[PDB]
Design an enzyme around this catalytic site. Structure first.
Site, PDB file in Angstrom:
ATOM      1  N   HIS A 118      45.720  49.637  34.396  1.00 56.97           N
ATOM      2  CA  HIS A 118      45.431  49.560  32.967  1.00 56.97           C
ATOM      3  C   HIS A 118      44.451  50.627  32.500  1.00 56.97           C
ATOM      4  O   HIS A 118      44.379  50.942  31.313  1.00 56.97           O
ATOM      5  CB  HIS A 118      44.964  48.147  32.578  1.00 56.97           C
ATOM      6  CG  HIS A 118      43.516  47.866  32.837  1.00 56.97           C
ATOM      7  ND1 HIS A 118      43.084  47.171  33.944  1.00 56.97           N
ATOM      8  CD2 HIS A 118      42.416  48.077  32.075  1.00 56.97           C
ATOM      9  CE1 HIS A 118      41.782  46.960  33.855  1.00 56.97           C
ATOM     10  NE2 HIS A 118      41.352  47.499  32.729  1.00 56.97           N
TER      11      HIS A 118
ATOM     12  N   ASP B  48      47.744  45.627  39.185  1.00 56.80           N
ATOM     13  CA  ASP B  48      46.829  46.424  38.391  1.00 56.80           C
ATOM     14  C   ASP B  48      46.001  47.426  39.169  1.00 56.80           C
ATOM     15  O   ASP B  48      44.768  47.399  39.131  1.00 56.80           O
ATOM     16  CB  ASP B  48      45.911  45.519  37.578  1.00 56.80           C
ATOM     17  CG  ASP B  48      45.236  46.258  36.453  1.00 56.80           C
ATOM     18  OD1 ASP B  48      45.771  47.301  36.012  1.00 56.80           O
ATOM     19  OD2 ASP B  48      44.171  45.804  36.009  1.00 56.80           O
TER      20      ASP B  48
ATOM     21  N   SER C 251      36.130  47.601  35.141  1.00 55.22           N
ATOM     22  CA  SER C 251      37.516  47.734  35.580  1.00 55.22           C
ATOM     23  C   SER C 251      37.544  48.845  36.613  1.00 55.22           C
ATOM     24  O   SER C 251      37.077  49.951  36.346  1.00 55.22           O
ATOM     25  CB  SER C 251      38.436  48.133  34.425  1.00 55.22           C
ATOM     26  OG  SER C 251      38.572  47.079  33.487  1.00 55.22           O
TER      27      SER C 251
END
EC number: 3.4.21.-
Length: 242
Positions: free
Chosen positions: A72, A120, A195
């Site tokens: 992402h 991811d 992230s």
């Protein structure tokens, strides 16, 4: 469905990380990685994945020229490697002084979803510096472990750049694994900038990569979700690492 007992338990545990100001968080749970530690392993494998005008997240150096981050995050580049930069061990103090001890690295190639669109994780391949020296020659890549033997309740260290909290300041968050039936889920303080943060065990092995927060127990509760270095991910890493 889950009992109210389980919910209250979750809320109370989650409250230890978000019930108080991040600045007032106990050092044991969340702390700034100091200058000396930033130069040591595994901290020195952590870098800021920077997508100009899009996002500023985290990445882990896992190969001589390879950074592991979230899919992402990589998607923000829209397949354009020129839009992404990797700044290992970058530090911007509270007064705006930015230091990049190993320089800033250009991206040669983005493998947006080599583990599948449903995983991811993405691989970022870096160019070496102006002199042909790879980042992985300057810093030893993270030792890749496995998420296979992780257990509910295990405590691990998540290291990354909590952009939303402090700009370009590496922080470590202690996380506590919970229901592992559905992937890597854990209690811990994180922000979107985390992230791509590396999750390390006591042996200094990378066992997972932080992804984001997802609903937990029911639709109105949350938990951190990460991608563990399981069998498939490990296989693909061994295949494409460089």
């Amino acid at each position: 469905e889950v009992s109210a007992e389980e919910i209250k338990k979750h809320e109370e545990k989650w409250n230890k990380y978000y019930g108080v100001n991040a600045f007032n968080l106990p050092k044991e749970l969340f702390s700034k990685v100091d200058e000396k530690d930033r130069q040591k392993y595994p901290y020195n494998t952590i870098g800021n994945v920077f997508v100009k005008g899009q996002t500023s997240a985290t990445g882990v150096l896992i190969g001589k020229n390879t950074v592991l981050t979230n899919r992402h995050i990589a998607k923000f580049a829209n397949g354009d490697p020129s839009k992404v930069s990797f700044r290992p061990s970058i530090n911007t103090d509270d007064n705006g002084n930015t230091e990049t001890p190993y320089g800033e690295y250009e991206v040669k190639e983005i493998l947006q979803e080599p583990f599948g669109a449903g995983v991811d994780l993405a691989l970022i391949r870096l160019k070496p510096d102006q002199n042909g020296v790879s980042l992985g020659d300057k810093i030893s890549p993270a030792k890749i472990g496995t998420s296979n033997d992780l257990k509910d309740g295990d405590k691990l260290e998540l290291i990354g750049y909590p952009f939303d909290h402090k700009v370009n300041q590496m922080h470590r968050s202690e996380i506590e694994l919970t229901t592992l039936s559905r992937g890597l889920r854990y209690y811990g303080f994180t922000v979107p900038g985390n992230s791509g943060s590396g999750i390390f065990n006591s042996n200094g092995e990378l066992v997972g990569i932080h992804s984001s927060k997802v609903s937990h127990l029911d639709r109105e509760h949350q938990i951190n979700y990460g991608v563990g270095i399981g069998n498939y991910v490990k296989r693909i890493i061994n295949e494409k690492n460089e």
